[PDB]
Amino acid sequence: DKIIHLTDDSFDTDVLKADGAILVDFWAEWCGPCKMIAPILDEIADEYQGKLTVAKLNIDQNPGTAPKYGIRGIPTLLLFKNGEVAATKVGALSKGQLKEFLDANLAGSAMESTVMVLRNMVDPKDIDDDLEGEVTEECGKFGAVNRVIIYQEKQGEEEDAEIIVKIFVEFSIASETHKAIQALNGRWFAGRKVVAEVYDQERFDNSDLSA
Amino acid sequence: MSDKIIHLTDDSFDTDVLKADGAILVDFWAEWCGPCKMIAPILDEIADEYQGKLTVAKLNIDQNPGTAPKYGIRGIPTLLLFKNGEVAATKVGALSKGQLKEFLDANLAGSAMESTVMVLRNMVDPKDIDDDLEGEVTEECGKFGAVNRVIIYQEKQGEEEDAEIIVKIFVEFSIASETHKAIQALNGRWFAGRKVVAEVYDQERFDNSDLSA
Amino acid sequence: DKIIHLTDDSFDTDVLKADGAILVDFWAEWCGPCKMIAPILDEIADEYQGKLTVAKLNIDQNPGTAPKYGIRGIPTLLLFKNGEVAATKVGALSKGQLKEFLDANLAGSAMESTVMVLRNMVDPKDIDDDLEGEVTEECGKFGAVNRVIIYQEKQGEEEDAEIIVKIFVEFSIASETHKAIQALNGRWFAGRKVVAEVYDQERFDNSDLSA
Amino acid sequence: DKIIHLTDDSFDTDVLKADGAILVDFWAEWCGPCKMIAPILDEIADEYQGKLTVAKLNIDQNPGTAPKYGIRGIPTLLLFKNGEVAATKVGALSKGQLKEFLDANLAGSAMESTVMVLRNMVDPKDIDDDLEGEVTEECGKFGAVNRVIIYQEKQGEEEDAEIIVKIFVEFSIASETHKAIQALNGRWFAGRKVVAEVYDQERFDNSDLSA
Amino acid sequence: DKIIHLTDDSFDTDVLKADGAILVDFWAEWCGPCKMIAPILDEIADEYQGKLTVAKLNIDQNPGTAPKYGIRGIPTLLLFKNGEVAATKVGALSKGQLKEFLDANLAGSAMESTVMVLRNMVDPKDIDDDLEGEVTEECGKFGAVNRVIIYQEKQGEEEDAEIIVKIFVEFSIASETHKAIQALNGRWFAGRKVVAEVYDQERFDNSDLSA
Amino acid sequence: DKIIHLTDDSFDTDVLKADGAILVDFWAEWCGPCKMIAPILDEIADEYQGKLTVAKLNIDQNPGTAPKYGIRGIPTLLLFKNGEVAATKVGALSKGQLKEFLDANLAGSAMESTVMVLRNMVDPKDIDDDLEGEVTEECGKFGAVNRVIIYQEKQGEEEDAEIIVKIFVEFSIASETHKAIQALNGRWFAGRKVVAEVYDQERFDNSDLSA
Amino acid sequence: DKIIHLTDDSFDTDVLKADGAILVDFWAEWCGPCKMIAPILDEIADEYQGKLTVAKLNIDQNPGTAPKYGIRGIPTLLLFKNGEVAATKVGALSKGQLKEFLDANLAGSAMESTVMVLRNMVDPKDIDDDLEGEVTEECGKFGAVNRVIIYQEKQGEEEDAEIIVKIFVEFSIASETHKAIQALNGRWFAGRKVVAEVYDQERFDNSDLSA
Amino acid sequence: DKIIHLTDDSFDTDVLKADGAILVDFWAEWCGPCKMIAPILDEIADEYQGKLTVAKLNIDQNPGTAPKYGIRGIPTLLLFKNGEVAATKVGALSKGQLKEFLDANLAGSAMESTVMVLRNMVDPKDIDDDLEGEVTEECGKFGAVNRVIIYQEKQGEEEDAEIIVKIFVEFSIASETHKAIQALNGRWFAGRKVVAEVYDQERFDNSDLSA
């Protein structure tokens, strides 16, 4: 069949190291709602072949794994992608509900942001009057730049807590933001490895730079 | 050839509905009833599509005047869904096929989740409680799995001044497979001369400090 | 399909002089909201087959009828019951809002009521202490009578508007009500032809004796 | 304070013959939900002063009235307008819902209408193709006439029910309507005493000619 | 200061054996949400004086009580009435939210019902042809009886689950129901102590006799 | 092609110059949310065949068009009707939400208005005592004119803000408004193209002439 | 007192060219709802001293003005500020609702926008590759320009509908937008009088350029 | 007045380094929404005295500060505590809504959690079969430990993304949690500085360990 039958021993390889999304069902033979969703999972596995693999771990025969994920009730579904927990769903649900859960979470977000945030690129010490224009000019290589914010943020309530800089770069359209992230993410500049990634456009539009 | 839909009588109701196996949907109807007529082809389709998981029965209230009053039927059509002699749900009036299927699926479903919480009923009298109970429960229930927490809960039954006080003992395990083991090993056993109920308790209520159910 | 198409000429015969409930849709081809509701009327016509006729009047092709009802925008829905305008609704609505609209103005489309109303039976002047008991005893021949309300209602908001009497008789179960309506409707009683008919049970249950 | 405390003997005078809207609450001292709403009624009788009287009948002290209105559970609210039960509401509800309820029923009362209805003006027999134009011309003496509707209404579902005529005249602005009503109300036209009065502008604008 | 300051030792006396509704706040000094609701509770105690007592248990100083109610997070509010837990609220909320919570719960229900249920009055094997008439005759002492229903209900899905009898008696008006319950509740009839109480009118009206 | 694949060069012909409704999807290959809705668009193209054509513009391959519509994130859906922008929906969504969005916006509003507004027709200087009558007379050729308003509106708070004239024309019934708009919209008069369009009837009924 | 008395003759001077906001009450002596708000209006005149002048026009004695505003029923309240109609309110209301209506409408919006739209600046045919760059350069005089949209919009669905150009200029912060609108609104350029005004920021951020 | 008026020059000292919660309003004189909230802010400053400082920055007179927070439209409110941005609110709002916004954000959370997360405490390579047992015994020092989860989380989709360990400790009641967090947070164990903090009880209860 299309379903992967997991054990405690095979979990890391079948799930954590898999290519592609894996939907993990934590189940037991005596569990009413587990038996209810079992036919649905078989239908999911067929329909989403090529995009998702459905796997099941029986928690009676394999008691090692679920506690590591804080599983309480069953069934519980976990969607993994490339080793990350993308989403969790506790209890039974309809095939329609499951599909929307999957569709949404396989997409990863509801919208590609025009806003890029650069992390680990400068220290507060490095902020001068030129930096905004430099960022604008460098990022102008990828598309039209709407606005740049050099934002300083204190990481915790303590007096001695660390101050870091986040550099927001809002492009005119999300294709530009995408090119810039692709060119910049994981690049080394003067001794530091930059994280470039999307920043929630709704937060930014609402002056929330905290994320 | 026998119809899929049972035409109940007053006399057959006991056998055909209350003692039947599997869910039974009962339609109280009459020939002159407009809406009864609206839902008739829908019930025909329901009886086909839900074959194996549902029986559809009809009671004509003009021909069998005895039963409906026992269920406080007023207007017709009125639908009653039975399971194991229990009224699982009721529906007054005509509805769409979509609405009826929604009503059935919701009410046939059974529980959405197996809970980590066991409740032990009729196990101890409020007079039996002392400082050791919680510890004793924890040790006994430890044999089925890791016990997170135990609550010794006293509940007054009614507002009247002399209402009975009962005890519910809640045992939350780390994971539902443990809870299942405890319930299965404990439910229905006689301890110190009383028959104990051991069953799931709704996890969401418990998590929200609602110990009323 | 099951929806009826009207004309200015056919309107009197198909709607006004007709038996039963007719829901009339005033519409046109070019009307965006008329189009939106069209499939919803299709489903209603299906579900309510035998208890409601869904009829459509195109106001371009048939210009004479809508103005007599003071129709302004389209779609406008008019619910007729034996030449009586029962209710009106202007503008597009969902399937559920239309159901709610019919539920509240039809009653007989959901269920046969336990309540019977007797209209044109007695004049206010005739009401005495014995009337409740006499109605109870009379109606007791068709089955168990729960309650009788001798209800007085002022027709219109002018100081000397006429007062009418509706006699409500709630029976134990709708089979009894049916029997009473068949026996009593159209009977002569001291000079007047009695009108006996079902009264919306939900309205009655909520102490609304006004319809 | 503002609230009328009704009795059985005072009910008719205080409720059915009052000017404007009356909210009647049937209650009793032992009734928890009645106590729940007591504060809310207190406030409502304040905030709606000039547009609604709030009235209470204790069903224990005054057991006479409630059965005449098919009152069952308490609290029950009845909204009367000029002696007609306009709407009802059973059971406790928030300040919010009560406001929604009153607003749905009293909105036309907040304004002087541009719409006059003429009542008892013509027989259905008298309706010919000239009447609309003739109304338009006569009423043009009082101001700009937007529209005239010669509306026929059947009084009951019984086949031989009476049909009456209401003539709607919408003027451009409410001062014109007032002049017409002033000049026409209570007058004699071809031997009938005409009722000329404001008609709810919201109903008319929504094709509801039933009031 | 209308607020009762609880300890572990005073809890039973002050709360479980109190007269009237008691709202218990389980709280701590360091707790952010607890501090937020503190002035809200102060105003509630003032506004609701004579219908509610507000009482506070600090779970640091008095660690014995909260675990007996399965308290987890704070603040948690428990509303007590005659030693019964009527409702629970976990976490902070606005004053308006709390007032809604109290209003709903201080009223036992949204409506005083016309329907009485008599529990523990007869075993199934005692039901005969005469019971309905006999209940009707007896209950008629308290007001007009609309309908009586002898309902038999299986207690559980099991094979030899108990079957009990509930006798529903619907009065014409809620004041009659109230008198009946007052007189009948706790009375002894041939060997058993009867429970008489209100039964949700809306459920009854909808043929839901399960509660 | 039930689904049209757009280019910057074909956009005008395929979208702006098309008959009926076009849903434009602005998308890119790397975009997870865009990929999520691709199957849901496939269903839409099916279910709304004849009502709606789905069209897709890839913003990488065709960078010209999206900036002219203020497109930011992707996916973004723009509904066109006869080259008119009807509405916009930003981000992925369920099939249910998309169907909700389409039905309302295909319809355009809840109801076709009886009110037309004429824009760009006269300057405030041109207004004389004759204008109302002349409008009335011209518009009388399309049906019965209920009322004409000559409305002057200042375009902002600034001292030098333009004053414009909106001519409102309320017809007796929506079919007359549609004739007028179809006859007048886009005609040349005194050297300017007229704008004739529907105006929200609820706004108009409520003396809101600001739209 | 503080309430000013309007006539047709003084309306333009007293209302349209006033400094500071004016609430105009269109009223008459026989209007019951008018008399109802009259105390409310005196208290408002008192409370809003220096922020608002209250003003009354009796439509009997001053029949010319109210038709210019599409007044129908009375009372109708219009709020004017700097010769624009800020808001309209039909019918009587509480002092509480009126304060709410005034506070929101005196403010004129919930937020001052960063977006300016320029209307009547260019026609489709004048659009070229230079325009965006030109608008950016001129507007950069007022502050940092984030983005410019050259947007084309067809005025209705008909075949001959006019296509107009709206130029959106999004600034970095609302103080810039304000400078720009004050400079540009009502200026003459190439023989056309331009409108410069705020555009709803939420709409713009959601790619809705339709308003 | 208790309102503090800020300058660019004074901002860091008076806001980022202030004691207690500071509410900053970015405003301007010409801004209608800012004037609307001005009197509400006055009431807030008085009501929350000792608990909140309300401050204002005029963006025309102090143009430096707002762009550093990505301020766009005005008014915008930022709430600061200990140099952290606790919350933001764009646009005008009622006194009611601001009080709700402030109460919630001053509280910090709706409820004190039973669940503690220990972050940066161990490396994935340190994990073994004894670690859960050792955490349990240590944390047993503060109170009754319900459950311990050793959670390994991969930080990114990248094949070499870092793997971190979060240790969850759920106690029986929130006061135990509090003790453990206060004793553990910011301590150094084995040369790494540990974060011990509350973890959202609802997320934990639903097996979501992602935060």
Ligand SMILES: NCc1ccc(-c2ccccc2N2CCNC(=O)C2)cc1
């Ligand atoms: N965790 C990141 C993430 C964020 C958004 C989506 C998402 C994608 C497509 C359609 C809906 C979506 N959502 C998700 C939940 N909440 C919503 O309201 C809508 C998916 C993952």
Ligand SMILES: NCc1ccc(-c2ccccc2N2CCNC(=O)C2)cc1
């Ligand atoms: N003077 C400080 C400074 C800081 C950051 C940037 C910059 C910002 C965004 C994207 C690329 C950037 N560059 C690319 C070239 N070389 C670099 O070091 C970084 C530039 C200058």
Ligand SMILES: NCc1ccc(-c2ccccc2N2CCNC(=O)C2)cc1
């Ligand atoms: N406990 C002292 C403290 C120290 C720093 C901040 C602070 C927080 C956020 C962003 C900037 C900050 N600063 C402050 C001044 N000097 C700067 O240049 C940076 C707040 C309090």
Ligand SMILES: NCc1ccc(-c2ccccc2N2CCNC(=O)C2)cc1
């Ligand atoms: N004549 C014998 C008799 C049989 C059934 C009932 C009865 C009444 C009400 C509800 C359930 C009922 N049963 C109990 C038995 N087993 C069932 O499953 C159903 C009562 C008497």
Ligand SMILES: NCc1ccc(-c2ccccc2N2CCNC(=O)C2)cc1
């Ligand atoms: N202190 C009295 C007491 C009360 C309840 C339990 C108990 C709780 C949970 C599960 C099993 C239990 N036992 C098993 C052994 N014998 C028993 O009597 C019951 C134990 C001791």
Ligand SMILES: NCc1ccc(-c2ccccc2N2CCNC(=O)C2)cc1
């Ligand atoms: N024809 C090309 C063109 C179109 C628009 C603008 C323009 C845009 C925004 C604000 C001011 C503007 N200007 C001010 C100076 N002179 C002007 O005529 C208009 C400029 C050039």
Ligand SMILES: NCc1ccc(-c2ccccc2N2CCNC(=O)C2)cc1
């Ligand atoms: N972000 C942390 C945080 C979380 C909850 C509260 C909070 C406190 C008290 C009353 C309500 C509250 N809320 C906040 C909004 N949404 C809600 O669901 C309830 C405050 C801050």
Ligand SMILES: NCc1ccc(-c2ccccc2N2CCNC(=O)C2)cc1
């Ligand atoms: N790898 C072994 C280990 C890892 C973590 C804990 C630990 C967990 C929770 C709270 C404190 C802890 N400690 C550790 C150091 N010494 C202490 O006194 C307390 C204990 C052992």
